[PDB]
Curated annotation (Swiss-Prot):
Quaternary structure and partners: Monomer.
Cysteine pairings via disulfide bonds: 6-21, 8-16, 15-38, 29-35, 34-59, 47-66
Stated name of the protein: Disintegrin jarastatin
Function comment: Binds alpha-5/beta-1 (ITGAV/ITGB1), alpha-V/beta-3 (ITGAV/ITGB3) and alpha-M/beta-2 (ITGAM/ITGB2) integrins. Is a potent inhibitor of platelet aggregation induced by ADP, collagen, and thrombin. Induces neutrophil chemotaxis and inhibits the chemotaxis of human neutrophils toward fMLP, IL-8, and jarastatin itself. Directly activates an integrin-coupled signaling and modulate the MAPK pathway in different ways, leading the neutrophils to express different functional response. Induces Erk-2 translocation to nucleus and a delay of the spontaneous apoptosis of neutrophils.
The organism's place on the tree of life at top rank: Eukaryota
Chain location of the short sequence motif Cell attachment site per the record: 51-53
Domain Disintegrin: 1-73
Coiled-coil regions listed in the entry: none
Length: 73
């Protein structure tokens, strides 16, 4: 979202930096599993590593939220 949850929304977020609710360069995201150091995790990077039971969800690279795997998320 990064709307009301612009700086964090809930403290249980990766970067949770207020610079994301500001026009400060360097911070692109504060929320989502695909957000690392307030930066979008590069496409191809998993936001969820599989382990037999789980399946690998891959980040879109330009999205902080973990995109649903089209091959059964």
């Amino acid at each position: 979202e990064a709307g009301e949850e612009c700086d964090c929304g809930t403290p249980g977020n990766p970067c949770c930096d207020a610079a994301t609710c500001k026009l400060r360069p360097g911070a692109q995201c504060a929320e989502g599993l695909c957000c690392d150091q307030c930066r979008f995790m590069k496409e191809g990077t998993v936001c969820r590593r599989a382990r037999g039971d789980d399946m690998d969800d891959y980040c879109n690279g330009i999205s902080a939220g973990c995109p649903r795997n089209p091959f059964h998320a």
